[PDB]
PDB file of C-alpha atoms in Angstrom:
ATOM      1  CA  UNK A   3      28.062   2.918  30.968  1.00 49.98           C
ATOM      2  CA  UNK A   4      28.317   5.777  28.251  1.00 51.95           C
ATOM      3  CA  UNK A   5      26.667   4.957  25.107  1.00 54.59           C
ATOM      4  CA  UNK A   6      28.707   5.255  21.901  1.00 51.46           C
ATOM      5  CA  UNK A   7      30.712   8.132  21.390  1.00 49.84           C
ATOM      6  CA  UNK A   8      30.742  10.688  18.467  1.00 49.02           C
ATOM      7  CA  UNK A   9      34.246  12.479  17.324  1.00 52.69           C
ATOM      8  CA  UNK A  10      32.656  14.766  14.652  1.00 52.27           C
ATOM      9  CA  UNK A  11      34.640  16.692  11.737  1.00 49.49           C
ATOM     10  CA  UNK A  12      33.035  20.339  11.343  1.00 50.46           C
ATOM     11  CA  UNK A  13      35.131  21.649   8.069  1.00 50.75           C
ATOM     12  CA  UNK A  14      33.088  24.711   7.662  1.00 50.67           C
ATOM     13  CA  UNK A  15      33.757  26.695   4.097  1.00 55.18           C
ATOM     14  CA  UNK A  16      36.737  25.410   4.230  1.00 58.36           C
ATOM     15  CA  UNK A  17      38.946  23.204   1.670  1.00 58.29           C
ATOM     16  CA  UNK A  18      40.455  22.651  -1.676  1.00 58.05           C
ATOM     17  CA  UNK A  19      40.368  19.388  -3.559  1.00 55.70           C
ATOM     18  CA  UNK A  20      43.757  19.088  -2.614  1.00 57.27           C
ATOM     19  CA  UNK A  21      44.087  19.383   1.082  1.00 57.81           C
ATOM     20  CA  UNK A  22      40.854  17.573   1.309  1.00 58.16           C
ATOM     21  CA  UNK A  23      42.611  14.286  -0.587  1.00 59.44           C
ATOM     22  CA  UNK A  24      46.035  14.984   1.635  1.00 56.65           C
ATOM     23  CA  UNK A  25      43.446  14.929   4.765  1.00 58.30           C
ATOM     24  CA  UNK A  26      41.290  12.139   3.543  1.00 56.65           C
ATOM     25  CA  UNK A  27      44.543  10.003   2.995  1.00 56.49           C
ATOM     26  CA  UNK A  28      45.319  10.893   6.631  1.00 54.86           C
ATOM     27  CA  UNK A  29      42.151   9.796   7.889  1.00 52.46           C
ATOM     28  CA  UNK A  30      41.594   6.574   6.098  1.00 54.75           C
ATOM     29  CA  UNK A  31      45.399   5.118   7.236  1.00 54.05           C
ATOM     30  CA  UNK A  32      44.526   5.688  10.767  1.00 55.19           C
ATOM     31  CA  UNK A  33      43.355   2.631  12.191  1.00 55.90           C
ATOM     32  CA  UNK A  34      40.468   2.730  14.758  1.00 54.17           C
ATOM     33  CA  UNK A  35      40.390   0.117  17.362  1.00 49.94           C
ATOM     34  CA  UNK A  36      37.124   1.006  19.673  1.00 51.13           C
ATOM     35  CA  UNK A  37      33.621   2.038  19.164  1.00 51.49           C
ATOM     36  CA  UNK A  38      33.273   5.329  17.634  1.00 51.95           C
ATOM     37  CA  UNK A  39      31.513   7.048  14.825  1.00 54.84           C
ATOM     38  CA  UNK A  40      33.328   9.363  13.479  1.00 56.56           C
ATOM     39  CA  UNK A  41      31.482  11.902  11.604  1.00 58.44           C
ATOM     40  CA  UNK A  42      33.060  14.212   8.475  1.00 58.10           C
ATOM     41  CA  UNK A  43      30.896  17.417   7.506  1.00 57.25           C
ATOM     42  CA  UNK A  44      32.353  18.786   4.115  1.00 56.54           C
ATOM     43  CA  UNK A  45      30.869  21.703   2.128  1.00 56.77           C
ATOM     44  CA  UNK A  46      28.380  20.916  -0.238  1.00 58.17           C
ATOM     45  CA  UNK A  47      30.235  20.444  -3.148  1.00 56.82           C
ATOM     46  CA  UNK A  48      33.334  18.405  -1.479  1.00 54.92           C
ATOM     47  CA  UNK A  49      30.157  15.898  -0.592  1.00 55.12           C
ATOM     48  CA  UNK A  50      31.029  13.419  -3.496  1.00 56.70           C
ATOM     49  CA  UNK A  51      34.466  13.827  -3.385  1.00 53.95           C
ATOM     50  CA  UNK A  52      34.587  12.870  -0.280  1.00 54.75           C
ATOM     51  CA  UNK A  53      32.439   9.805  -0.880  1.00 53.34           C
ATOM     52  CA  UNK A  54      34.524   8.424  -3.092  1.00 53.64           C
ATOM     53  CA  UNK A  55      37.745   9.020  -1.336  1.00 57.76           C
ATOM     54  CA  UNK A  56      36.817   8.328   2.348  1.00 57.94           C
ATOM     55  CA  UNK A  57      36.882   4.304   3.285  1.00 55.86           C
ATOM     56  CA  UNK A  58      37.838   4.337   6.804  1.00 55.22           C
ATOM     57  CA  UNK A  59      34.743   1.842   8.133  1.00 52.39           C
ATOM     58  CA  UNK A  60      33.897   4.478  10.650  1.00 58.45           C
ATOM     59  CA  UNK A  61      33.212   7.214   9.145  1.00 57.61           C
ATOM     60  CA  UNK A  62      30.149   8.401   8.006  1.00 54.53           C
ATOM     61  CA  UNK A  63      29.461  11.710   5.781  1.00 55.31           C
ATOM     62  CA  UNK A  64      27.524  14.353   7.074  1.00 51.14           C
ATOM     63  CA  UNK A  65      25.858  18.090   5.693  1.00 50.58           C
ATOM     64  CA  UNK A  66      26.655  20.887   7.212  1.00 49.39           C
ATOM     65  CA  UNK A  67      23.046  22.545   6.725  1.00 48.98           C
ATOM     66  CA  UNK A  68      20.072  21.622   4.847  1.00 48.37           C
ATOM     67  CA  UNK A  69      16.308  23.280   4.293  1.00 47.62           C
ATOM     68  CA  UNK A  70      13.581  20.592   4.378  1.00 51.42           C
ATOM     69  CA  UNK A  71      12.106  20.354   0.688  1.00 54.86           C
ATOM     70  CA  UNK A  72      13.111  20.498  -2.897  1.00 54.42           C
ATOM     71  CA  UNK A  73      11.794  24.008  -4.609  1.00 58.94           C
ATOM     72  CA  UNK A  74      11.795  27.303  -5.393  1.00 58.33           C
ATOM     73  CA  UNK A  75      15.156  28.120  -2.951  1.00 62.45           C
ATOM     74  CA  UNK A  76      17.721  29.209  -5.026  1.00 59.38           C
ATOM     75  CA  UNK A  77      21.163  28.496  -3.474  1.00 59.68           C
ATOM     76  CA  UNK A  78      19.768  25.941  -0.630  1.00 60.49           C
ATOM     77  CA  UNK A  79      19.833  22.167  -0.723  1.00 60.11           C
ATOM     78  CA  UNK A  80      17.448  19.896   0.809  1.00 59.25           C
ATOM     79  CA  UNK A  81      16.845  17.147   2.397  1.00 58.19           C
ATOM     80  CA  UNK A  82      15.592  14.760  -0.200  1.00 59.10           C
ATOM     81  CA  UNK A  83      18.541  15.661  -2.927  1.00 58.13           C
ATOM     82  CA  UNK A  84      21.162  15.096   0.220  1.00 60.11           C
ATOM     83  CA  UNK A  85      19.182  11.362   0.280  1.00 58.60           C
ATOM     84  CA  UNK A  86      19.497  10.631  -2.993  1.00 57.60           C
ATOM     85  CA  UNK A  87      23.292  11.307  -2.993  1.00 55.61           C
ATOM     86  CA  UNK A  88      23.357   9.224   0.108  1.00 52.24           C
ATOM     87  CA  UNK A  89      24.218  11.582   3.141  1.00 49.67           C
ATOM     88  CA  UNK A  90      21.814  10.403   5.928  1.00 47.86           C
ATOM     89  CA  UNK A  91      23.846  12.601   8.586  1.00 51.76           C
ATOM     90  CA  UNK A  92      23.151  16.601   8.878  1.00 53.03           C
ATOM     91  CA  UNK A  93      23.899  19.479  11.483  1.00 53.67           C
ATOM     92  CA  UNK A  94      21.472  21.431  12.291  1.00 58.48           C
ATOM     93  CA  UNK A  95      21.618  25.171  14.038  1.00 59.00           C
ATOM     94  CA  UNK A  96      25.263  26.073  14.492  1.00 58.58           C
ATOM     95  CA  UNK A  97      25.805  29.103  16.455  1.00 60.56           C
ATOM     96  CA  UNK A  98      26.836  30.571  12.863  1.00 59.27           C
ATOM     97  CA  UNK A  99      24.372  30.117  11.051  1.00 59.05           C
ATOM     98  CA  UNK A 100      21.828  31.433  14.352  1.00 55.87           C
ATOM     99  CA  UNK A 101      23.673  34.235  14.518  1.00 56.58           C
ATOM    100  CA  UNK A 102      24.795  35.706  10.324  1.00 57.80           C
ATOM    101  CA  UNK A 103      21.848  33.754   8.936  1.00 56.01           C
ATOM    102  CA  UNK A 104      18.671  34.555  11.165  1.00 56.87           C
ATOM    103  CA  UNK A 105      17.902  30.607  12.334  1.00 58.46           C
ATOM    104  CA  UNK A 106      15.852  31.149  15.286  1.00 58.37           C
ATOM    105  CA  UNK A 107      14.925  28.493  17.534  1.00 60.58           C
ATOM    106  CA  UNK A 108      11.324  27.898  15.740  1.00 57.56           C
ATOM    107  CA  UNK A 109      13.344  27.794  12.335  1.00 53.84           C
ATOM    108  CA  UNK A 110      15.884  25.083  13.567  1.00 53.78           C
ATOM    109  CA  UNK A 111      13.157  22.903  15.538  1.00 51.46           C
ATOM    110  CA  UNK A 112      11.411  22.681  12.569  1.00 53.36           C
ATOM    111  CA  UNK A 113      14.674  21.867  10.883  1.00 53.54           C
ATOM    112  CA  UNK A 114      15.105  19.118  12.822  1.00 52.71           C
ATOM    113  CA  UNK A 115      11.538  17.482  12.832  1.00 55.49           C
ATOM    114  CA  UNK A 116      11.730  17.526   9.229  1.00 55.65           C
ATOM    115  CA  UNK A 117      15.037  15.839   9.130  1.00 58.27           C
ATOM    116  CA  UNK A 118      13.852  13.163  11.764  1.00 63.47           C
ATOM    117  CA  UNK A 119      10.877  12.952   9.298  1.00 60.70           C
ATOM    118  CA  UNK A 120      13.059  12.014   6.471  1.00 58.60           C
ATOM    119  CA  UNK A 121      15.409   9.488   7.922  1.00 59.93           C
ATOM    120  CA  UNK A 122      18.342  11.447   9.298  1.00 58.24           C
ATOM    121  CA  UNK A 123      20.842  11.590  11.724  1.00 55.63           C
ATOM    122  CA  UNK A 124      20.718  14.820  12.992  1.00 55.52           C
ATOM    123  CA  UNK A 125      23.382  17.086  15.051  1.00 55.86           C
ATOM    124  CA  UNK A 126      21.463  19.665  16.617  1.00 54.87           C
ATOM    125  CA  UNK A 127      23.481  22.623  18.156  1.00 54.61           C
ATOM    126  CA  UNK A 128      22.939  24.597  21.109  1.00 57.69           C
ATOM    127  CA  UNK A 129      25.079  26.647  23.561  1.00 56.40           C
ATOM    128  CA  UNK A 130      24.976  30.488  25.588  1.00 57.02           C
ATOM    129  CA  UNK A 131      26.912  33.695  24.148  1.00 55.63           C
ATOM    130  CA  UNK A 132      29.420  34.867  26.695  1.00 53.56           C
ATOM    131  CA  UNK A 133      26.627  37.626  28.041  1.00 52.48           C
ATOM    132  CA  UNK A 134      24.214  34.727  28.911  1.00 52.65           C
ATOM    133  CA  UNK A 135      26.832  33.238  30.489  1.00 51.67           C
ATOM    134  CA  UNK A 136      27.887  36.252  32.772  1.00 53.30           C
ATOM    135  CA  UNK A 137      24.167  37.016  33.253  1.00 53.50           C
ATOM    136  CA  UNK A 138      23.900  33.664  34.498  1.00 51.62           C
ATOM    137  CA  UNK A 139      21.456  32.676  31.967  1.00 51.59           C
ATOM    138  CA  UNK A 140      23.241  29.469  30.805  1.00 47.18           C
ATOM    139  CA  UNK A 141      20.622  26.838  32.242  1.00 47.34           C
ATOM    140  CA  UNK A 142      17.738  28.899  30.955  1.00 48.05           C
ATOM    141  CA  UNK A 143      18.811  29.712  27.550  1.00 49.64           C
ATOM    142  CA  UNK A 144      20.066  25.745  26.714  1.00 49.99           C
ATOM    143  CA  UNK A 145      17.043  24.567  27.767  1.00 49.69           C
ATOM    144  CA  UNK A 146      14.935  27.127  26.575  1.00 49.50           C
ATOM    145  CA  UNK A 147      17.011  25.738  22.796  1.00 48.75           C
ATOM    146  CA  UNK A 148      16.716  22.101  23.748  1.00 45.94           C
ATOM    147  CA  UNK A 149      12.706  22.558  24.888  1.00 47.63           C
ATOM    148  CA  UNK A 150      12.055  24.363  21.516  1.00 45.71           C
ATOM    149  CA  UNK A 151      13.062  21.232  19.652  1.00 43.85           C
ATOM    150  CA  UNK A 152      11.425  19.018  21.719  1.00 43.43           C
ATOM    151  CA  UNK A 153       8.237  20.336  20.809  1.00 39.56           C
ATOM    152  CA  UNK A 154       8.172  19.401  17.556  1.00 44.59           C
ATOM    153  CA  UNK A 155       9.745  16.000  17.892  1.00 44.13           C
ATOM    154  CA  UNK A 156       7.685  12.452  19.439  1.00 44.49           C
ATOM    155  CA  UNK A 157       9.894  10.566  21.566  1.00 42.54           C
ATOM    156  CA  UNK A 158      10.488   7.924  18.736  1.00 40.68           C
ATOM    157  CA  UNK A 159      12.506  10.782  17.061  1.00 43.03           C
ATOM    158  CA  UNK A 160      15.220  11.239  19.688  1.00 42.03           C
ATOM    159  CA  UNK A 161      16.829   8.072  18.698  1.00 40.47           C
ATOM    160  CA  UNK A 162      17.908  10.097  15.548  1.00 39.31           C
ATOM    161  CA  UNK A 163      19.095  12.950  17.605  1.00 39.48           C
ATOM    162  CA  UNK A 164      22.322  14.063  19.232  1.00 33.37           C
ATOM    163  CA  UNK A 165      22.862  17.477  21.240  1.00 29.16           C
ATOM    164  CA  UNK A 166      25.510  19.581  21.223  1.00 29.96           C
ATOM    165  CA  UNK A 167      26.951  21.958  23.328  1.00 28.63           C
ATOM    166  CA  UNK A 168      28.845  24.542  21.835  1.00 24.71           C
ATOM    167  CA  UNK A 169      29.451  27.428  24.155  1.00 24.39           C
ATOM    168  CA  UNK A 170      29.571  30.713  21.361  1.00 24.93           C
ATOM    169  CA  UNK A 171      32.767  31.483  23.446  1.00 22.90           C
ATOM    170  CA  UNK A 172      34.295  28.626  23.017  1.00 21.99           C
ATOM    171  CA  UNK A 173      33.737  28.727  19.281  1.00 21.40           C
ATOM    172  CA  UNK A 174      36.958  29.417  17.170  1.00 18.94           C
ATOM    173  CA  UNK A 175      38.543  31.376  19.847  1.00 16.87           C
ATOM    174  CA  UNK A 176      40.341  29.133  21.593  1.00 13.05           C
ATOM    175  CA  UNK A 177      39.040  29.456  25.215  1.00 13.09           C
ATOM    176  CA  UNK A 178      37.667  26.021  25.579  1.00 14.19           C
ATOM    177  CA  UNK A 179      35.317  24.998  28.360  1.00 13.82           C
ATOM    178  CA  UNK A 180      36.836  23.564  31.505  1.00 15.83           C
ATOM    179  CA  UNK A 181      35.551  20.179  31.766  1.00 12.52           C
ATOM    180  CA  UNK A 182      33.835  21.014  35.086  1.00 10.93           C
ATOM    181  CA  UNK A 183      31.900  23.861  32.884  1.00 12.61           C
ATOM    182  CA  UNK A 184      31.015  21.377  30.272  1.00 13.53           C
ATOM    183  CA  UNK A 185      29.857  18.095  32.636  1.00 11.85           C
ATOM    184  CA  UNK A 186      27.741  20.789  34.756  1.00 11.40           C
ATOM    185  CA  UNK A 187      25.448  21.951  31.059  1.00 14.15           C
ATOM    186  CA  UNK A 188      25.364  18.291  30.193  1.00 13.13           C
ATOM    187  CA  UNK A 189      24.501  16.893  33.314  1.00 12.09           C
ATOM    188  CA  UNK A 190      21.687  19.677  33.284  1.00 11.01           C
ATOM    189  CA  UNK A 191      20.617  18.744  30.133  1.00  7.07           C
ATOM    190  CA  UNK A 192      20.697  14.657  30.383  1.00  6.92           C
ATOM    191  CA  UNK A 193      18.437  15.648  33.158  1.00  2.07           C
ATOM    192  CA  UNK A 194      15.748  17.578  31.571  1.00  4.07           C
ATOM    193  CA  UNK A 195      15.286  14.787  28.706  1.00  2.42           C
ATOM    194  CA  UNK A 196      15.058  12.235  31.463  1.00  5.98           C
ATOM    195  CA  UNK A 197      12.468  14.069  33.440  1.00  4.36           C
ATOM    196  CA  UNK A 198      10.574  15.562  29.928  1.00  4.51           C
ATOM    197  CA  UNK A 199      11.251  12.720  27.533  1.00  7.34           C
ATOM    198  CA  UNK A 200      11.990   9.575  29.153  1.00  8.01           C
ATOM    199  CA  UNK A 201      14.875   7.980  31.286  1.00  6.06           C
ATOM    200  CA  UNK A 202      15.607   5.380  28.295  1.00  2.00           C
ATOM    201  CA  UNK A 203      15.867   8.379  25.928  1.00  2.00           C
ATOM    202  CA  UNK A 204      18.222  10.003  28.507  1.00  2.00           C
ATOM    203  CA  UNK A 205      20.198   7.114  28.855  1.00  2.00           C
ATOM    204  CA  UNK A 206      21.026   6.616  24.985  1.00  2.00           C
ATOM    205  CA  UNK A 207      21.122  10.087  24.168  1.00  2.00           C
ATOM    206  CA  UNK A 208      24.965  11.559  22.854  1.00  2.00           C
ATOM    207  CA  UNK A 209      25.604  15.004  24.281  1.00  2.00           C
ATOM    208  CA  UNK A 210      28.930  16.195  22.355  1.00  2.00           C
ATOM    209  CA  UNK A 211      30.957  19.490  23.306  1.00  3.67           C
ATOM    210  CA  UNK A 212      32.207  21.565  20.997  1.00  5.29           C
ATOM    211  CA  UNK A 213      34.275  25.017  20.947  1.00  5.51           C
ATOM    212  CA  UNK A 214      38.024  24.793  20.800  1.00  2.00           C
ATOM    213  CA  UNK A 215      38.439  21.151  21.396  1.00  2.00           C
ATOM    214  CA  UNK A 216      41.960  19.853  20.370  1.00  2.00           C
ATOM    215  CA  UNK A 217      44.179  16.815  20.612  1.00  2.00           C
ATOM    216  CA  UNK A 218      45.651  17.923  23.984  1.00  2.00           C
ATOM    217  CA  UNK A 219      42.071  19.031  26.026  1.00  2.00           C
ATOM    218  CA  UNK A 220      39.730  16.185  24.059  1.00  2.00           C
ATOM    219  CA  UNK A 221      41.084  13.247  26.635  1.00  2.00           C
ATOM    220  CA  UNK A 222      40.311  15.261  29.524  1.00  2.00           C
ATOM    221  CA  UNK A 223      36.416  16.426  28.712  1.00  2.00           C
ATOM    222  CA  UNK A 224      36.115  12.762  27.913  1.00  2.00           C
ATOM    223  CA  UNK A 225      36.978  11.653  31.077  1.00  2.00           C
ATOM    224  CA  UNK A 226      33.661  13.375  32.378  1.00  2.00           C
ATOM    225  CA  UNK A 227      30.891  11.099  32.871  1.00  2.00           C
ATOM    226  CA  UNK A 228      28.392  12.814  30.289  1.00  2.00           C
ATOM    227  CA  UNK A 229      30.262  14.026  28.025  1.00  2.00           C
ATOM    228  CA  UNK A 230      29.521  11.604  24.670  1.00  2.00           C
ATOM    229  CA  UNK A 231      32.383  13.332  21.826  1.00  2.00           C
ATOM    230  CA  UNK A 232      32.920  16.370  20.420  1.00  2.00           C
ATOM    231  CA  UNK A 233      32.278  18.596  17.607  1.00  2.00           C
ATOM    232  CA  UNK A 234      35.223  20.043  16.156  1.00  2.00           C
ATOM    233  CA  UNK A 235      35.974  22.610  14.115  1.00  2.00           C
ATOM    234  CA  UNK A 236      39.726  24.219  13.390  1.00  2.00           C
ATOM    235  CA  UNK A 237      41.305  21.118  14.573  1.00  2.00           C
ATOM    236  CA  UNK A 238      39.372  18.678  12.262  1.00  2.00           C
ATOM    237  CA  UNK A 239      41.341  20.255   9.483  1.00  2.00           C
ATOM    238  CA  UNK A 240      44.295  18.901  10.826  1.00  2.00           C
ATOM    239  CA  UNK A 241      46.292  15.469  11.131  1.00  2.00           C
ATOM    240  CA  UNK A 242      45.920  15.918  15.015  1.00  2.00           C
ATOM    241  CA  UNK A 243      41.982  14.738  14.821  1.00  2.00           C
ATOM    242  CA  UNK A 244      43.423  11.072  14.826  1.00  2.00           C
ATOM    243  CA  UNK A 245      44.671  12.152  18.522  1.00  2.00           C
ATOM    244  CA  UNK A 246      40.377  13.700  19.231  1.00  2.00           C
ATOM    245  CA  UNK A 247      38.835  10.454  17.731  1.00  2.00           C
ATOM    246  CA  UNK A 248      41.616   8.170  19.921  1.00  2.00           C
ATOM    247  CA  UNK A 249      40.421  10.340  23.339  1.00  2.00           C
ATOM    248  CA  UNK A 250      36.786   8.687  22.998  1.00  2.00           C
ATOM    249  CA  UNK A 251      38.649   5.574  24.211  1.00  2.00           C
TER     250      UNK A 251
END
């Protein structure tokens, strides 16, 4: 069977203290009858009110970013301040910040050890840009991503961990991955941790989808045997991501 799924709430910079209490609201009514965690990711400074608006049992709060010590980085948070506020959930190298803010895979694998390190949850992103894909590059450049993590992580670690797949493509634009494209990445990449990590690993491990998931196409990616939940951006903004979390049934 497929282990627990993941419907996860990528906000972005997005939100006013307003919307984000209408949206809460929405989100705590909603009554959730199977065996989910549902993930939120607000901005930084939406973090506590968030905390003290959000009660829905499932939900847990996550960052969308975080550098992995406390110093002389004006403008960053880390990892041990998100701890002491109590977010034990972060994502870690989204296509965006890859691409406008120079993470390279070395910078996010050591992201990720360090959040492992300290305790966390972590949502690690991959995916191809539309030229990999036409190259046909896909398979090399995911697991060329996924190996450069590994390498800093002990196989302890990947209990912590959760991959996903975010085609750049699919990101925002609304040309979202056929389920057929998505279950042939995952199944690729289930693969590679069995043969590289361990079968057990493999077994447990969530591999979400993300890029222009919505209430309408969420039911059928889940149907697909590896796909684990999604990672949603524009549509976690709306009402509608009651209809994403219910598709994990």
């Amino acid at each position: 069977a497929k282990p627990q799924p993941i419907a996860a709430a990528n906000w972005k910079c997005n939100g006013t203290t307003a919307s984000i209490e209408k949206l809460v609201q929405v989100f705590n009514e909603h009554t959730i009858s199977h065996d989910v965690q549902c993930v939120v990711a607000p901005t930084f400074v939406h973090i506590p009110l968030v905390q003290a608006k959000l009660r829905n049992p499932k939900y847990v709060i996550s960052a969308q970013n975080a550098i992995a010590k406390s110093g002389a980085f004006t403008g960053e948070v880390s990892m041990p301040i998100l701890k002491d506020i109590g977010v034990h959930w972060v994502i870690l190298g989204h296509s965006e910040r890859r691409t406008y803010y120079g993470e390279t895979d070395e910078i996010v694998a050591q992201k990720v050890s360090e959040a492992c390190k300290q305790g966390f949850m972590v949502i690690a992103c991959i995916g191809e840009t539309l030229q990999q894909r036409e190259a046909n590059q896909t398979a090399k450049v995911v697991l060329s991503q996924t190996s450069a993590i590994a390498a800093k992580l002990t196989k302890d670690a990947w209990n912590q961990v959760v991959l996903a797949y975010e085609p750049v493509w699919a990101i925002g634009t609304g040309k979202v991955a056929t389920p057929e494209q998505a279950q042939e990445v995952h199944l690729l990449l289930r693969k590679w941790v069995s043969e590289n990590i361990g079968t057990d690993v493999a077994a447990k491990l969530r591999i979400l989808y993300g890029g222009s998931v919505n209430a309408a196409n969420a039911a059928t990616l889940y149907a697909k045997p590896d796909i684990n939940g999604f990672l949603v951006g524009g549509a976690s903004l709306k009402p509608e991501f009651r209809d994403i979390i219910d598709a994990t049934r």
